[PDB]
Amino acid sequence: WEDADFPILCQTCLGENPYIRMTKEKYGKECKICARPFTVFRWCPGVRMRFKKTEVCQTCSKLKNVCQTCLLDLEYGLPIQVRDAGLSFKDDMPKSDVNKEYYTQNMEREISNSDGTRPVGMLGKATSTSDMLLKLARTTPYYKRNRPHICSFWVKGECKRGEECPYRHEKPTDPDDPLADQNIKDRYYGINDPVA
Amino acid sequence: MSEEKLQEKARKWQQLQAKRYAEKRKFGFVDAQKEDMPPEHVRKIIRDHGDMTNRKFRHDKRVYLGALKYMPHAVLKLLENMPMPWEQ
Amino acid sequence: VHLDPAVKEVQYNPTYETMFAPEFGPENPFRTQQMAAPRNMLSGYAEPAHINDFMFEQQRRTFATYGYALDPSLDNHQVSAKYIGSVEEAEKNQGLTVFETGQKKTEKRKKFKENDASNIDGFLGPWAKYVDEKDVAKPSEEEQKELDEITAKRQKKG
Amino acid sequence: RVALEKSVSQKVAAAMPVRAADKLAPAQYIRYTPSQQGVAFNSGAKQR
Amino acid sequence: PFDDEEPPLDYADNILDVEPLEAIQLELDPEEDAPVLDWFYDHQPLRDSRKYVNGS
Amino acid sequence: SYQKLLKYYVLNALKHRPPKAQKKRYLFRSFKATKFFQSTKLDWVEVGLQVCRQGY
Amino acid sequence: MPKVKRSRKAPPDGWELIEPTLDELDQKMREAETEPHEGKRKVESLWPIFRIHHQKTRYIFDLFYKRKAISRELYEYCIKEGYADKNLIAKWKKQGYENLCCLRCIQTRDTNFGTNCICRVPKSKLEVGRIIECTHCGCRGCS
Ligand SMILES: [Zn+2]
Ligand SMILES: [Zn+2]
Ligand SMILES: [Zn+2]
Structure with a gap:
C-alpha cells in the first residue's frame, strides 16, 4: 500500500x-483509478471553496505526471489527451482490469528498485517541447475551478437553510452540452475527453 | 518616522507578545476535562437511529457493525454496576 | 570550489567560498520548467519547518479576513520584505492583523434580544436571527421553469 | 538492529490491535517550493 | 417477561414518569441504631462528607 | 455441595501467581480523549435497555 | 406528571414559587425530544436540546446571582436534581465566557486542529458579515 508524506499538487x-x-x-x-488504498490529504484552498481532497494515489499521478486532484498536467495545466497528442505520444498501459493489476505491480517493482522520483521513463519517450503546448498552457491560476457545488434543493425550488447556504445559487450547465458528461477515467486515459 | 506610527507599533508589539507568551499557551498546558453533556442528548440519538432501516443514517451502518468487538466490555460494565435491593 | 554539487550530509564545516561559488558552464536547453527546479519530489521541494504556532496561525487568519499577509519565503531576495496578494489594502489598513482592535467598525447587522429565560417560547440568547434576511428563498418566477426543463431533459435520457 | 526491530514492531503491532487507542499529536510544519513558480500562482510569494 | 415479538419499551415515556415502588430496606430502631440511621441505605453513603471519607 | 466449594477455593489460592507488573493502560480514557465519544449521567435502567437495543 | 425526585427529602423553602416556569420548561424539552427529524438535517435535529438546556441553566443562574431571589439551599437543590448544569454555570462566572452555548463549543479536543469553533470568535473580527450557524450547537456567535 502507498504511504506518502506529501501530495503531488498543482x-x-x-x-x-x-x-x-x-x-x-x-x-x-x-x-x-487503480483501486489501491492511499493516504488522503484534505485542505481548504481559500475563503469560500470546496475544501478539496486528493483523488488518486501518487503512483497513478507519477505515470501521467499529473496533480492528484484535478489531473491537469504539472508542466502546463492542460489535459492529458492534449499533451500526449501534441507530442504524437500514446500510452501502452492496458485497459482491462486484470491486466491493469499486472501492470500496476510491475511499475511498483520498477519504482521501488529505481530512483522512482522521476517521470523520465514515460517522459523520456517524448521529451521535446512543442509550440502547440507552450501557447495553450495557463500562465495564471483558474480559481473559478475551486468554487462550491450547486445546491440541489435550490434547483428543486425550495431552498431551506436560506442565505447561509454555502453551495452556489446559480444555474447549472445545460445537460445537452457535450461538456457535461466528463469521467475521471476518460480524462485520465485521455479517451473522448470533451474538454481536450 | 512619526511618533504616531511608533505608538501604533508599540500597540501592535504589546498585543503580539502578550498573547504569544500568554499563560494558557505554556508548554505544560493541558486543556480542561470533557465535562458531561445533557442526558437528553444520547436519548434522541438512539431514538432517531432506531434499527438502522432508514435511508438517512446509512453512513453509520459500518460503525454499528464495527462496534461489536467491544460489546463484551459493555455487557461486563453494565451488570457490574447493577443496583442493590435497597436502592430504588 | 572543492565541494561536489551532488552532495548531502557534509561531515565537516565548509567555508562560504568553498560551497556557494557558481557551477561553471552553459545550461542545457533539454530541461523544462519542472525539470530545472530543485525538486525533491515530483512537484517540488518539501522540507520540515518548525515555525512558531502563534505566528503561522495569525498570518494565515489575516489573509482570509483581508487578503494581505507577510511573505513566508526564506530566500527570494534577501533585501527587503513585502506584503503579498492584494498589497493595496496592506498600506491602506496600516498592516493590522485579526488579533487587534480593528480600524473599521461600522454598519453592524441588527438582531433581536430577549435575554431573560423566563418567557417560555420567547427566549433566544445567542441563537438570535438577524432581522432583515429571511428563510425560504427561491430564485424566480421563470428560472424555476428553466430548471423544470433541465430535470425533464434528464428524464428523457434514462 | 534498528532497521530490523522497526520492521519487527510493525509485525508485532498486528498481534495486539485493540489493547489501547493509539495517541497521535505530532502536528508538524513543512516548507514547500512549488517548482512551477510564477508571479500570479502563489498570489506573490516564492514559497508556501 | 416480554414476549418475543414485543419490541423493547422506550424508557422515555413508559418508565420516565412512573414513581418507583418501595425497596426492601429494613426499618432501623431509632433510639438505638442512631449513628448509622442517617445514611445507611444511601448509594455510596458518606461520599459528600470529608470527615468520614476522602472524596468522590 | 459444601465439599465441592472447598475444591475450587484451594485450587485458586494454590495456582495463584503474583501480578507481572504490567504497565497501566486505561481503555475508556483512551476512548473519551477522542472526538467520537461523549459522556453523560443516566439511570441504570435506561442504559440497560440501550445496550440490549444496541446489541440487537 | 412532574419529574420523579431522586432525593426523597422535602424540597427547600422557596420551591413553590419557581414551579410554574420550571415544570413548563421541562414540558418544552419533552416536545423537542419527539419532533420529527424528517424536514431537517442530520445534525440540525439536536439543536433544540442544547438550546433549552441553556435556557433552564440560565434561569436558576439569574435568580441567584442577579435577582437574589433564592437561598443557597434551593440553589444547590436545583443543581442536584438536574434543573441546572453545574459545569455551564462555572464558565458564565469567568470573564469572557458569559453567554456560552455549550461545553462542546469550547472543548478543543472535539476538533481536528485542536481549537474552538467559529462560534467563539468575536463578530467584529470577522469583518465580512458571513452569517454563522454552529454545527455543534446552532449558535450565531456567543462572544
Ligand atoms: Zn454552542
Ligand atoms: Zn459553537
Ligand atoms: Zn455560541
Whole structure:
C-alpha cells in the first residue's frame, strides 16, 4: 500500500493563500483509478471553496505526471489527451482490469528498485517541447475551478437553510452540452475527453 | 518616522507578545476535562437511529457493525454496576 | 570550489567560498520548467519547518479576513520584505492583523434580544436571527421553469 | 538492529490491535517550493 | 417477561414518569441504631462528607 | 455441595501467581480523549435497555 | 406528571414559587425530544436540546446571582436534581465566557486542529458579515 508524506499538487488546486492547514489520513480512501488504498490529504484552498481532497494515489499521478486532484498536467495545466497528442505520444498501459493489476505491480517493482522520483521513463519517450503546448498552457491560476457545488434543493425550488447556504445559487450547465458528461477515467486515459 | 506610527507599533508589539507568551499557551498546558453533556442528548440519538432501516443514517451502518468487538466490555460494565435491593 | 554539487550530509564545516561559488558552464536547453527546479519530489521541494504556532496561525487568519499577509519565503531576495496578494489594502489598513482592535467598525447587522429565560417560547440568547434576511428563498418566477426543463431533459435520457 | 526491530514492531503491532487507542499529536510544519513558480500562482510569494 | 415479538419499551415515556415502588430496606430502631440511621441505605453513603471519607 | 466449594477455593489460592507488573493502560480514557465519544449521567435502567437495543 | 425526585427529602423553602416556569420548561424539552427529524438535517435535529438546556441553566443562574431571589439551599437543590448544569454555570462566572452555548463549543479536543469553533470568535473580527450557524450547537456567535 502507498504511504506518502506529501501530495503531488498543482498551484491552482493548492490555493491562493500560502499558509495552508491540511489533514493527513492514512489509507482513508481507494484510488479512483487503480483501486489501491492511499493516504488522503484534505485542505481548504481559500475563503469560500470546496475544501478539496486528493483523488488518486501518487503512483497513478507519477505515470501521467499529473496533480492528484484535478489531473491537469504539472508542466502546463492542460489535459492529458492534449499533451500526449501534441507530442504524437500514446500510452501502452492496458485497459482491462486484470491486466491493469499486472501492470500496476510491475511499475511498483520498477519504482521501488529505481530512483522512482522521476517521470523520465514515460517522459523520456517524448521529451521535446512543442509550440502547440507552450501557447495553450495557463500562465495564471483558474480559481473559478475551486468554487462550491450547486445546491440541489435550490434547483428543486425550495431552498431551506436560506442565505447561509454555502453551495452556489446559480444555474447549472445545460445537460445537452457535450461538456457535461466528463469521467475521471476518460480524462485520465485521455479517451473522448470533451474538454481536450 | 512619526511618533504616531511608533505608538501604533508599540500597540501592535504589546498585543503580539502578550498573547504569544500568554499563560494558557505554556508548554505544560493541558486543556480542561470533557465535562458531561445533557442526558437528553444520547436519548434522541438512539431514538432517531432506531434499527438502522432508514435511508438517512446509512453512513453509520459500518460503525454499528464495527462496534461489536467491544460489546463484551459493555455487557461486563453494565451488570457490574447493577443496583442493590435497597436502592430504588 | 572543492565541494561536489551532488552532495548531502557534509561531515565537516565548509567555508562560504568553498560551497556557494557558481557551477561553471552553459545550461542545457533539454530541461523544462519542472525539470530545472530543485525538486525533491515530483512537484517540488518539501522540507520540515518548525515555525512558531502563534505566528503561522495569525498570518494565515489575516489573509482570509483581508487578503494581505507577510511573505513566508526564506530566500527570494534577501533585501527587503513585502506584503503579498492584494498589497493595496496592506498600506491602506496600516498592516493590522485579526488579533487587534480593528480600524473599521461600522454598519453592524441588527438582531433581536430577549435575554431573560423566563418567557417560555420567547427566549433566544445567542441563537438570535438577524432581522432583515429571511428563510425560504427561491430564485424566480421563470428560472424555476428553466430548471423544470433541465430535470425533464434528464428524464428523457434514462 | 534498528532497521530490523522497526520492521519487527510493525509485525508485532498486528498481534495486539485493540489493547489501547493509539495517541497521535505530532502536528508538524513543512516548507514547500512549488517548482512551477510564477508571479500570479502563489498570489506573490516564492514559497508556501 | 416480554414476549418475543414485543419490541423493547422506550424508557422515555413508559418508565420516565412512573414513581418507583418501595425497596426492601429494613426499618432501623431509632433510639438505638442512631449513628448509622442517617445514611445507611444511601448509594455510596458518606461520599459528600470529608470527615468520614476522602472524596468522590 | 459444601465439599465441592472447598475444591475450587484451594485450587485458586494454590495456582495463584503474583501480578507481572504490567504497565497501566486505561481503555475508556483512551476512548473519551477522542472526538467520537461523549459522556453523560443516566439511570441504570435506561442504559440497560440501550445496550440490549444496541446489541440487537 | 412532574419529574420523579431522586432525593426523597422535602424540597427547600422557596420551591413553590419557581414551579410554574420550571415544570413548563421541562414540558418544552419533552416536545423537542419527539419532533420529527424528517424536514431537517442530520445534525440540525439536536439543536433544540442544547438550546433549552441553556435556557433552564440560565434561569436558576439569574435568580441567584442577579435577582437574589433564592437561598443557597434551593440553589444547590436545583443543581442536584438536574434543573441546572453545574459545569455551564462555572464558565458564565469567568470573564469572557458569559453567554456560552455549550461545553462542546469550547472543548478543543472535539476538533481536528485542536481549537474552538467559529462560534467563539468575536463578530467584529470577522469583518465580512458571513452569517454563522454552529454545527455543534446552532449558535450565531456567543462572544
Ligand atoms: Zn454552542
Ligand atoms: Zn459553537
Ligand atoms: Zn455560541
